[PDB]
């Protein structure tokens, strides 16, 4: 258990494909334990989704690749957890 | 083994009849479904807004949507999707 | 064996009598009912609005509705339903 | 066997005497009462408003009512009732 | 496990002695398992404190004596828990 | 044996130097101190207000106050205190 | 031995480049560090404000500060410090 452990991505995307498709593909990466997609807000042609990815030594670029290949773009990385222990934010 | 779509939060519109209970039962009788939670969002005239949370393993979206429509329901939005081996909650 | 209806949150309106502790007792005595929670939402002139939470296994809605209605209450709406092997909570 | 009335929350009005500690002790001394919690809601110039939560097995309402009345208090309302094998919480 | 188990007191006391001593003396009473003193507000010559006393079969008169013999006064009993099971107030 | 001052929540005022890191460090090296948490409440032109939480057994206030003093800090108030065999939280 | 600085929460300012993932990775690769959490507070024109929480044992601040500065980061303030054997949370 090392490297990138959890990422929270601010992603913008068209209506297609559906977020279940995004979720599935991402979840199928080998170093990924689970993926959560939260619909932030849908608009006229786009959709704003918050993706939480849990894993072990996650390959950002890989993750960004799957996302972009499906027409989505990453607007920002909101949270990054790295290491042996999943450290939560102290608000 | 646990994989695929694990949880779906669905925004659904439907007529008073049949009652949410039938939906819950029918959805819960699906093969990979562990459980189903149907929360009433708001009642209107001849209409009813519910939030459907379906937990299970490698769930079939299409099979779920099918059940719902087969009962006069319609899916307005997919609010949250969880996929993978571990259930990940939104940060 | 866990299956069927597992939990219901019923919005019920009823005259003052019988008291809610009687609704609770009667509902709790039903077979397959693990427990019952009756929350008082508001008291009116000659009526009360109460929230009923029923836990159990493979619950029979009609039977539960029967008890509530035999008792003088009316179900205005089913606010929550849970069905299946696992009691899944609502994600907020 | 665990059954009957399991937990009550009572809206009680009482004179300043006797003290809430006397109500709590006396009620906790009842045959099938596991515990009692008295939360002071408001002290008025000649009376007080308390919320009495009583936990137990097959609780006797009339008996609990009696103890409260012999002590000079009166039950204004029954806010929550729990009954059966398991203690269920409101959702 | 019988009698008074928890008490929450609204106490008024002059600046001296320090709460550090209240908590310390009270914690030293026979049937007390622990004491939590929370500072509500401090004024020009006094301060309002919240005393949480946990234990088994607590003696109110003893505690009250210890409080007064130190200069503080009990303005009110905010919560009382009696019995075999520590029952929290249902909100 | 677990007794006396168990936890303290200290409101402290101190010049920017020495840094809170040194404060936490020297306090944590005290005899019966299990751990220390220093929370920066507010920085000012020449001073900063921190909240200090000290966990341990039969803690010595005089000692704690001493160390804080020596580094130029000052205890403005004692917001919370726990004493006794068991750690009791406020209700 | 479980001692010293256990957890730190640093308010940091930095240019968009390099990404926060590299910071999170590099800080997690430091000896003594069990895990790192970088929360995005805000993105500005040429800058970015992040809150970094570091967990581990007997952490070296000067080392952490260096890694950050070596990457263009700057520590505007140390918001929380935990030191000792047990991780203590702010009350
Ligand atoms: Mg919009
Ligand atoms: Mg409407
Ligand atoms: Mg009304
Ligand atoms: Mg009304
Ligand atoms: Mg209604
Ligand atoms: Mg209703
Ligand atoms: Mg009232
Ligand atoms: Mg009044
Ligand atoms: Mg009043
Ligand atoms: Mg009332
Ligand atoms: Mg004042
Ligand atoms: Mg005052
Ligand atoms: Mg007062
Ligand atoms: Mg100031
Ligand atoms: Mg200021
Ligand atoms: Mg700005
Ligand atoms: Mg700043
Ligand atoms: Mg700052």
XYZ file of C-alpha atoms and ligand atoms in Angstrom:
656
model
C 0.000 0.000 0.000
C 1.830 3.028 -1.379
C 1.522 5.964 -3.759
C -1.739 7.553 -4.824
C -4.525 6.109 -2.689
C -7.650 8.235 -3.310
C -8.543 11.038 -5.712
C -11.577 13.318 -5.851
C -11.990 14.744 -9.338
C -14.047 17.683 -10.493
C -15.021 16.417 -13.949
C -17.045 18.087 -16.731
C -18.579 15.853 -19.393
C -21.201 15.623 -22.159
C -24.419 13.706 -21.451
C -22.997 10.758 -23.315
C -21.800 8.355 -22.314
C -23.755 7.803 -19.112
C -21.889 8.097 -15.825
C -22.438 4.367 -15.212
C -20.140 3.879 -18.166
C -17.558 6.200 -16.621
C -17.886 4.374 -13.311
C -17.549 0.928 -14.863
C -14.472 1.674 -16.987
C -12.654 3.412 -14.142
C -13.552 0.643 -11.697
C -11.981 -1.860 -14.111
C -8.460 -0.433 -13.810
C -6.336 -2.976 -11.965
C -5.122 -0.868 -9.048
C -8.631 0.437 -8.293
C -10.666 -0.720 -5.267
C -13.778 1.328 -5.990
C -15.187 4.378 -7.733
C -17.956 6.738 -6.713
C -19.567 9.180 -9.124
C -21.719 11.916 -7.596
C -23.868 13.916 -10.020
C -23.189 17.531 -9.087
C -25.440 19.160 -11.651
C -26.585 18.535 -15.191
C -26.848 21.342 -17.720
C -27.980 21.857 -21.303
C -25.293 19.882 -23.077
C -22.971 18.956 -20.228
C -22.867 17.365 -16.819
C -20.793 18.084 -13.727
C -19.737 14.997 -11.815
C -17.539 14.470 -8.766
C -15.515 11.235 -9.006
C -13.993 9.544 -5.944
C -11.427 6.853 -6.833
C -9.977 4.512 -4.214
C -6.977 2.360 -4.959
C -3.353 1.441 -4.415
C -0.652 3.348 -6.303
C -3.186 4.830 -8.729
C -1.854 5.919 -12.116
C -3.268 9.438 -12.491
C -2.424 9.705 -16.184
C -4.157 6.377 -16.754
C -7.218 7.623 -14.908
C -7.147 10.906 -16.840
C -6.848 8.890 -20.037
C -9.940 6.763 -19.435
C -11.874 9.898 -18.569
C -10.747 11.949 -21.558
C -11.141 9.026 -23.963
C -14.809 9.112 -23.019
C -15.200 12.801 -23.782
C -14.816 14.053 -20.237
C -12.269 16.551 -19.003
C -10.839 17.003 -15.516
C -11.513 20.512 -14.228
C -9.618 20.074 -10.992
C -8.289 17.628 -8.429
C -10.020 18.383 -5.134
C -8.448 15.795 -2.869
C -5.326 13.610 -3.026
C -4.430 10.929 -0.494
C -1.080 9.148 -0.762
C 0.726 6.646 1.435
C 0.170 3.593 3.650
C -2.720 5.090 5.548
C -5.839 6.696 4.116
C -5.555 10.068 5.869
C -8.758 12.127 6.074
C -8.870 15.920 5.945
C -8.920 17.848 9.239
C -11.490 20.629 8.643
C -17.166 -12.240 -6.784
C -17.897 -8.546 -6.163
C -17.426 -6.338 -9.248
C -19.268 -3.971 -11.581
C -22.049 -1.592 -10.562
C -22.591 -1.853 -6.809
C -25.004 0.944 -5.934
C -27.255 3.284 -7.898
C -29.133 6.321 -6.609
C -32.011 7.001 -8.967
C -34.250 10.019 -9.220
C -37.555 8.621 -10.515
C -40.940 10.082 -11.424
C -44.085 7.941 -11.206
C -47.890 7.874 -10.894
C -49.428 7.227 -7.453
C -50.186 3.720 -8.717
C -48.743 1.262 -8.242
C -47.374 2.112 -4.809
C -43.637 2.358 -4.143
C -43.901 -0.884 -2.262
C -44.413 -2.880 -5.436
C -41.355 -1.195 -6.967
C -39.278 -2.002 -3.918
C -40.339 -5.650 -3.941
C -39.864 -6.171 -7.675
C -36.495 -4.406 -7.628
C -35.448 -6.408 -4.547
C -36.280 -9.646 -6.256
C -33.686 -9.028 -8.909
C -30.912 -11.563 -8.891
C -27.868 -9.553 -7.934
C -29.707 -7.090 -5.712
C -28.790 -7.133 -2.015
C -31.391 -4.556 -1.081
C -33.417 -1.569 -2.130
C -34.366 1.647 -0.428
C -37.122 3.885 -1.790
C -37.371 7.354 -0.216
C -40.335 9.597 -1.022
C -39.114 12.981 -2.214
C -42.431 14.656 -2.865
C -46.016 13.922 -3.803
C -47.912 15.976 -6.352
C -51.161 15.537 -8.224
C -51.182 12.117 -9.875
C -47.404 12.174 -9.565
C -44.759 11.062 -7.080
C -41.013 11.755 -6.855
C -38.877 9.056 -5.241
C -35.170 8.442 -4.700
C -34.336 4.767 -5.284
C -31.134 3.362 -3.767
C -30.221 -0.088 -5.080
C -27.397 -2.084 -3.508
C -25.990 -5.244 -5.007
C -23.292 -6.852 -7.101
C -22.518 -6.305 -10.771
C -26.028 -4.850 -11.157
C -27.635 -4.644 -14.582
C -28.696 -1.047 -15.183
C -30.798 -2.027 -18.163
C -32.599 -4.711 -16.183
C -33.367 -2.193 -13.445
C -34.612 0.532 -15.765
C -36.695 -2.151 -17.419
C -38.462 -3.089 -14.228
C -39.143 0.552 -13.368
C -40.593 1.486 -16.792
C -42.617 -1.756 -16.789
C -44.462 -0.236 -13.850
C -45.008 3.202 -15.261
C -41.880 4.654 -13.761
C -39.308 6.805 -15.495
C -35.757 7.617 -14.505
C -35.121 11.347 -14.426
C -31.538 11.154 -13.226
C -28.721 8.950 -11.964
C -27.590 10.825 -8.872
C -24.860 8.490 -7.732
C -23.055 5.421 -8.999
C -20.693 3.199 -7.083
C -18.715 0.565 -8.933
C -15.849 -1.736 -8.076
C -15.014 -4.255 -5.390
C -15.257 -1.813 -2.463
C -18.250 0.424 -1.780
C -16.830 3.937 -1.939
C -18.744 6.864 -0.458
C -18.427 10.409 -1.840
C -15.870 12.554 0.042
C -34.529 -16.028 5.823
C -34.212 -12.301 5.024
C -36.295 -11.267 2.058
C -39.271 -9.078 1.135
C -40.309 -5.854 2.801
C -37.944 -5.080 5.631
C -38.774 -1.560 6.778
C -41.559 0.992 6.307
C -41.895 4.603 7.406
C -45.561 5.453 7.322
C -47.025 8.931 7.602
C -50.261 8.422 9.509
C -53.105 10.718 10.568
C -55.462 9.498 13.298
C -58.000 10.692 15.841
C -56.649 11.038 19.395
C -57.872 7.579 20.407
C -56.545 4.970 20.708
C -53.286 6.331 22.099
C -50.106 5.793 20.065
C -48.724 3.321 22.619
C -51.615 1.061 21.625
C -50.824 1.328 17.914
C -47.261 0.414 18.790
C -48.215 -2.602 20.898
C -50.639 -3.999 18.323
C -48.237 -3.526 15.416
C -45.359 -5.000 17.388
C -47.410 -8.110 18.089
C -47.698 -8.881 14.365
C -45.651 -11.870 13.213
C -42.319 -11.094 11.585
C -42.233 -7.655 13.171
C -38.917 -7.096 14.946
C -39.913 -3.729 16.349
C -41.987 -0.575 16.001
C -41.295 3.099 16.487
C -44.046 5.643 16.583
C -43.008 9.269 16.452
C -45.474 12.054 17.249
C -45.284 14.754 14.577
C -48.090 17.015 15.761
C -51.261 17.152 17.825
C -54.330 18.917 16.455
C -57.858 19.769 17.551
C -58.993 16.137 17.566
C -56.276 14.524 15.482
C -52.595 13.589 15.471
C -49.984 13.212 12.773
C -47.514 10.447 13.579
C -44.530 8.785 11.850
C -44.487 4.957 12.100
C -41.290 2.986 11.527
C -41.698 -0.784 11.269
C -38.747 -3.160 11.200
C -38.889 -6.885 10.464
C -38.658 -9.589 7.803
C -40.814 -10.220 4.756
C -43.448 -7.833 6.148
C -47.027 -8.007 4.870
C -48.056 -4.447 3.962
C -51.788 -5.168 3.750
C -51.718 -6.787 7.184
C -49.856 -3.782 8.621
C -52.286 -1.425 6.890
C -55.079 -3.536 8.301
C -53.952 -2.997 11.882
C -53.450 0.739 11.442
C -56.849 1.150 9.765
C -58.672 -1.152 12.187
C -57.296 1.128 14.891
C -58.780 4.238 13.314
C -55.688 5.545 11.592
C -55.178 6.408 7.958
C -51.945 6.121 5.947
C -51.393 9.432 4.166
C -48.169 8.297 2.599
C -45.402 5.686 2.614
C -42.274 7.767 3.176
C -39.715 4.971 3.068
C -39.590 1.329 2.056
C -36.769 -1.182 2.340
C -36.774 -4.594 0.657
C -34.228 -7.364 0.219
C -31.658 -9.223 2.295
C -29.843 -6.160 3.554
C -31.380 -3.088 5.164
C -30.037 -0.457 2.748
C -30.158 3.148 4.028
C -30.977 6.209 1.923
C -27.880 8.010 0.585
C -28.148 11.752 1.282
C -38.960 -12.668 26.544
C -38.478 -9.106 25.234
C -41.718 -7.604 24.136
C -44.377 -4.998 24.730
C -43.531 -1.366 25.330
C -39.776 -0.841 25.159
C -39.163 2.925 25.302
C -41.267 5.998 25.997
C -40.468 9.692 25.694
C -42.833 11.704 27.845
C -43.554 15.402 27.852
C -44.123 16.036 31.562
C -45.073 19.197 33.483
C -44.324 19.322 37.205
C -44.049 21.735 40.162
C -40.471 22.481 41.259
C -40.920 19.847 43.938
C -40.009 17.168 44.200
C -36.710 17.490 42.294
C -36.136 15.773 38.952
C -33.658 13.456 40.675
C -36.566 12.074 42.694
C -38.596 11.353 39.579
C -35.661 9.642 37.920
C -34.828 7.450 40.912
C -38.436 6.479 41.626
C -39.092 5.601 37.968
C -35.828 3.675 37.609
C -36.850 1.566 40.578
C -39.756 0.078 38.618
C -39.823 -3.671 37.967
C -38.976 -3.771 34.274
C -37.284 -0.435 33.696
C -33.690 -0.639 32.548
C -33.097 3.085 32.768
C -34.527 6.591 32.854
C -33.341 9.916 31.446
C -34.812 13.229 32.514
C -33.862 16.204 30.408
C -34.928 19.616 31.710
C -36.681 21.522 28.942
C -37.619 24.751 30.678
C -37.887 26.040 34.196
C -40.784 28.369 34.793
C -41.521 30.478 37.823
C -43.636 27.824 39.518
C -43.209 24.722 37.344
C -40.841 22.863 35.004
C -41.023 21.111 31.639
C -39.179 17.808 31.380
C -38.671 15.146 28.763
C -38.667 11.705 30.380
C -37.195 8.885 28.279
C -37.816 5.479 29.835
C -36.176 2.300 28.604
C -37.231 -1.202 29.558
C -39.019 -4.423 28.716
C -42.793 -4.736 28.470
C -43.283 -1.368 30.187
C -46.461 -0.598 32.130
C -47.756 2.755 30.962
C -50.407 3.104 33.692
C -47.831 2.189 36.289
C -45.359 4.753 34.943
C -48.202 7.233 34.722
C -49.069 6.553 38.352
C -45.557 7.107 39.672
C -45.400 10.409 37.792
C -48.806 11.532 39.073
C -48.321 10.505 42.703
C -45.222 12.677 42.518
C -47.368 15.626 41.434
C -46.487 15.681 37.763
C -48.666 15.217 34.737
C -47.952 13.774 31.285
C -48.721 16.366 28.638
C -47.917 14.155 25.649
C -46.369 10.854 24.512
C -43.764 11.906 21.952
C -42.182 8.616 21.057
C -43.081 4.987 21.560
C -40.930 1.945 20.858
C -42.339 -1.594 21.127
C -41.355 -5.171 20.309
C -38.237 -7.336 20.314
C -35.807 -4.810 18.892
C -35.411 -1.123 19.700
C -36.182 0.737 16.489
C -35.106 4.338 15.892
C -37.121 6.856 13.919
C -35.840 7.413 10.381
C -25.630 -0.506 38.570
C -28.560 1.266 40.255
C -29.532 4.787 41.255
C -28.088 7.989 39.816
C -25.568 7.334 37.049
C -25.202 10.652 35.312
C -25.901 14.257 36.240
C -25.462 17.425 34.201
C -25.295 20.521 36.330
C -25.568 24.181 35.589
C -23.276 25.682 38.225
C -22.333 29.273 39.033
C -19.081 29.904 40.896
C -16.638 32.725 41.640
C -13.357 32.666 39.754
C -11.777 30.848 42.694
C -11.006 28.093 42.986
C -10.240 26.955 39.440
C -12.493 24.446 37.648
C -9.401 22.265 37.699
C -10.056 21.828 41.431
C -13.785 21.247 41.081
C -13.287 18.439 38.599
C -10.507 17.101 40.786
C -12.403 17.054 44.094
C -15.630 15.742 42.571
C -13.682 13.031 40.727
C -12.475 11.911 44.117
C -15.912 11.115 45.540
C -16.729 7.477 46.338
C -18.976 6.413 43.485
C -17.708 8.670 40.744
C -16.118 7.220 37.627
C -15.365 10.528 35.980
C -16.074 14.232 35.780
C -16.337 16.634 32.873
C -16.404 20.335 33.533
C -17.194 22.541 30.564
C -16.792 26.288 30.736
C -19.955 27.997 29.469
C -19.121 31.644 30.038
C -16.911 33.647 32.355
C -18.007 37.021 33.678
C -16.538 39.914 35.608
C -16.517 38.022 38.921
C -18.035 34.656 38.140
C -18.342 31.939 35.531
C -21.022 29.496 34.435
C -19.929 25.866 34.132
C -21.453 22.610 32.949
C -20.548 19.680 35.222
C -21.050 16.165 33.848
C -20.686 13.550 36.565
C -20.642 9.897 35.604
C -20.785 7.059 38.078
C -22.862 4.466 39.853
C -25.510 5.115 42.461
C -24.500 8.756 42.943
C -25.361 10.726 46.067
C -26.797 14.122 45.085
C -26.568 15.618 48.559
C -22.921 14.656 48.843
C -22.020 16.155 45.460
C -24.073 19.295 46.125
C -22.260 19.701 49.420
C -18.890 19.409 47.742
C -19.991 22.019 45.201
C -21.211 24.510 47.800
C -18.277 23.831 50.125
C -16.108 25.123 47.308
C -18.132 28.250 46.649
C -20.197 27.181 43.687
C -23.982 26.799 43.616
C -26.158 24.500 41.521
C -28.480 26.694 39.505
C -30.211 23.690 38.013
C -30.083 19.975 37.205
C -30.051 19.864 33.388
C -30.116 16.120 32.941
C -30.396 13.085 35.190
C -29.778 9.470 34.245
C -30.853 6.742 36.650
C -30.976 2.972 36.453
C -28.901 0.092 35.140
C -28.471 1.393 31.634
C -27.114 4.809 30.715
C -30.009 6.093 28.621
C -29.475 9.139 26.404
C -32.282 11.614 25.761
C -34.120 10.996 22.512
C -34.158 14.310 20.618
C -3.990 3.552 38.334
C -6.034 5.993 36.270
C -6.892 9.062 38.340
C -6.912 12.849 38.552
C -6.673 15.329 35.673
C -7.195 13.343 32.463
C -7.789 15.985 29.839
C -7.451 19.742 29.612
C -8.570 22.176 26.914
C -6.415 25.287 27.197
C -7.050 28.702 25.636
C -3.536 30.161 25.174
C -2.063 33.442 23.875
C 1.513 33.392 22.637
C 3.924 35.411 20.472
C 4.542 33.956 17.001
C 7.722 32.342 18.376
C 8.530 29.770 19.511
C 6.289 27.907 17.043
C 3.304 25.818 18.160
C 5.271 22.791 16.920
C 7.801 23.328 19.705
C 4.957 23.810 22.199
C 3.236 20.598 21.287
C 6.621 18.880 21.347
C 7.747 19.977 24.809
C 4.303 19.408 26.312
C 4.143 15.870 24.875
C 7.407 15.002 26.571
C 5.893 15.621 30.007
C 5.752 12.767 32.493
C 2.230 11.391 32.200
C 1.243 12.886 28.878
C -0.228 10.558 26.287
C -0.558 13.222 23.641
C -1.120 16.855 22.771
C -3.106 18.656 20.118
C -2.526 22.342 19.318
C -5.137 24.108 17.213
C -4.358 27.557 15.821
C -7.442 29.637 16.555
C -6.328 33.010 15.170
C -3.091 34.764 14.188
C -2.606 38.455 14.915
C 0.032 41.084 14.266
C 2.286 39.955 17.110
C 0.478 37.069 18.764
C -1.581 34.006 17.994
C -4.400 32.350 19.971
C -4.159 28.560 20.128
C -6.316 25.916 21.802
C -4.366 23.193 23.566
C -5.739 19.739 24.326
C -3.685 17.567 26.677
C -4.488 13.890 27.244
C -2.851 11.841 29.981
C -3.159 10.468 33.506
C -3.010 12.345 36.794
C -1.739 15.335 34.831
C 0.068 18.068 36.666
C -1.390 21.467 35.891
C 1.356 23.377 37.645
C 3.846 21.628 35.423
C 1.879 22.180 32.233
C 1.356 25.835 33.127
C 5.040 26.149 33.831
C 6.213 24.882 30.466
C 3.735 27.115 28.634
C 4.918 30.105 30.690
C 8.608 29.486 30.128
C 8.085 29.696 26.394
C 6.298 33.007 26.828
C 2.777 31.723 26.401
C -0.086 32.540 28.729
C -3.179 30.573 29.745
C -6.183 32.825 29.242
C -8.644 30.160 30.326
C -9.367 26.491 30.927
C -12.257 25.672 28.586
C -12.661 22.025 29.602
C -11.419 19.571 32.204
C -11.834 15.856 32.708
C -10.733 14.128 35.880
C -11.206 10.648 37.291
C -10.904 6.998 36.255
C -12.834 7.329 33.006
C -12.852 10.012 30.344
C -16.244 11.713 30.393
C -17.415 13.902 27.532
C -19.807 16.834 27.898
C -23.514 16.206 27.322
C 8.954 4.262 19.730
C 5.657 6.068 18.983
C 6.639 9.638 19.781
C 7.150 13.205 18.559
C 5.069 15.061 15.964
C 2.327 12.695 14.804
C 0.046 14.842 12.639
C 0.324 18.267 10.979
C -2.151 20.405 9.054
C -0.402 22.974 6.909
C -1.907 25.882 5.049
C 0.146 26.098 1.861
C 0.315 28.360 -1.184
C 1.752 27.192 -4.475
C 1.787 27.752 -8.226
C -0.429 25.522 -10.382
C 2.740 23.701 -11.387
C 3.641 21.173 -10.225
C 0.319 19.435 -9.620
C -0.838 18.580 -6.114
C -0.479 14.869 -6.874
C 3.295 15.177 -7.035
C 3.348 16.978 -3.664
C 1.125 14.335 -2.164
C 3.321 11.605 -3.591
C 6.655 13.108 -2.622
C 5.510 13.884 0.960
C 4.190 10.328 1.346
C 7.557 8.916 0.296
C 9.288 10.602 3.243
C 10.428 8.184 5.934
C 8.230 8.411 9.056
C 5.140 9.356 7.014
C 2.155 7.001 7.161
C 0.004 9.075 4.799
C -0.758 12.480 3.315
C -3.985 14.294 2.472
C -4.040 17.371 0.251
C -7.364 19.217 0.215
C -7.894 21.903 -2.407
C -9.066 25.064 -0.661
C -9.005 27.357 -3.651
C -7.664 27.945 -7.133
C -6.703 31.458 -8.063
C -5.187 33.138 -11.102
C -1.526 32.128 -10.932
C -1.750 30.373 -7.613
C -3.476 27.624 -5.649
C -4.256 27.260 -1.959
C -4.183 23.818 -0.361
C -4.545 22.316 3.094
C -2.052 19.438 3.640
C -2.541 16.972 6.489
C 0.458 14.722 7.279
C 0.319 11.598 9.442
C 3.261 9.550 10.706
C 5.717 9.111 13.556
C 8.269 11.526 14.959
C 7.893 13.733 11.870
C 10.640 16.174 10.908
C 9.122 19.563 10.116
C 12.211 21.067 8.463
C 12.248 18.096 6.153
C 8.565 18.475 5.232
C 8.994 22.217 4.797
C 11.916 21.581 2.455
C 10.167 19.106 0.178
C 7.371 21.641 -0.191
C 9.594 24.654 -0.902
C 11.808 22.600 -3.220
C 8.659 22.210 -5.280
C 7.732 25.858 -5.188
C 5.344 25.560 -2.280
C 5.254 27.842 0.748
C 3.749 27.205 4.178
C 1.543 30.160 5.123
C 0.557 28.705 8.489
C 0.576 25.575 10.713
C -3.109 25.141 11.630
C -2.921 22.016 13.800
C -0.161 20.029 15.486
C -0.466 16.646 17.214
C 2.442 15.342 19.319
C 3.078 12.360 21.589
C 2.104 8.695 21.862
C -1.625 8.929 21.226
C -3.233 10.916 18.426
C -5.375 13.515 20.176
C -8.189 15.330 18.436
C -9.267 18.878 19.128
C -12.225 19.052 21.490
Mg -26.848 24.962 -13.832
Mg -44.931 20.002 -5.752
Mg -51.691 22.016 13.854
Mg -51.852 19.693 11.197
Mg -49.522 14.228 6.278
Mg -46.916 12.338 4.064
Mg -45.440 20.539 26.145
Mg -41.492 29.827 30.391
Mg -43.333 27.179 29.434
Mg -46.108 17.777 23.895
Mg -21.791 37.308 30.391
Mg -23.947 35.375 33.231
Mg -27.151 29.801 35.228
Mg -7.349 37.877 18.642
Mg -7.907 39.233 14.997
Mg -10.015 33.870 -4.826
Mg -3.811 30.972 3.901
Mg -3.549 29.937 7.338
